[PDB]
Write a protein that binds this ligand. Structure first.
Ligand SMILES: COc1ccc(S(=O)(=O)N2CCc3cc(O)c(OC)cc3[C@@H]2C(=O)NO)cc1
Ligand SMILES: [Ca+2]
Ligand SMILES: [Ca+2]
Ligand SMILES: [Zn+2]
Ligand SMILES: [Zn+2]
Length: 173
């Protein structure tokens, strides 16, 4: 690995978040709690901390829209891509966007797991972290990778220990 032309990880030990828009399927307290639990699950492997702004854009703007929006790339609604985010490096960098049209769920049985999606998107917001593993927590297009329970599978650990470490295996793919 996940090498991109964007600074992989912010230069501060603490970052900011600003949830400009919110979903609807689950309440804002659940959005903040799932963001906080997902981010605590990221911060479980790296000593990076997160805070909220008082009056200004955060380095991790989190937003939701319902089929297209005033962004670099308009959403589609129910299908295809479910959320998208940008690599960190000030400005729009690190910010993440979600399609509220797609049915969100905390983790009950059926729907699109918010804890997984937030973890996925916030991972890119942290410092990138994609892969192509059969059960990758950042796997592109849902499949085998069980979203009900992920708690940073192997892709996340490999990304984090590749970024906040060095050692890696060779593979291509
Ligand atoms: C519920 O958790 C999910 C599941 C799927 C997706 S997604 O929107 O299909 N996803 C994978 C495919 C893809 C493909 C893209 O070309 C893309 O452009 C930036 C984004 C995505 C996203 C993604 O990786 N976002 O970081 C995003 C979050
Ligand atoms: Ca930003
Ligand atoms: Ca969609
Ligand atoms: Zn967008
Ligand atoms: Zn991704």
């Amino acid at each position: 690995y996940s090498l991109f032309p964007n600074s992989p990880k912010w230069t501060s030990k603490v970052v900011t978040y600003r949830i400009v828009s919110y979903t609807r399927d689950l309440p804002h307290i659940t959005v903040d709690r799932l963001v906080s639990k997902a981010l605590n699950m990221w911060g479980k492997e790296i000593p990076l901390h997160f805070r909220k702004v008082v009056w200004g854009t955060a380095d991790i703007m989190i937003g939701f829209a319902r089929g297209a929006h005033g962004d670099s790339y308009p959403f589609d609604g129910p299908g295809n891509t479910l959320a998208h985010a940008f690599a960190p490096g000030t400005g729009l960098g690190g910010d993440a966007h979600f399609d509220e049209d797609e049915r969100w769920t905390d983790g009950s049985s059926l729907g699109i797991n918010f804890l997984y999606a937030a973890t996925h998107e916030l991972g890119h917001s942290l410092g990138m972290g994609h892969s192509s593993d059969p059960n990758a927590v950042m796997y592109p297009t849902y499949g085998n990778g069980d979203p009900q329970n992920f708690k940073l599978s192997q892709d996340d650990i490999k990304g984090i220990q590749k970024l906040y470490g060095k050692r890696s295996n060779s593979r291509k793919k």
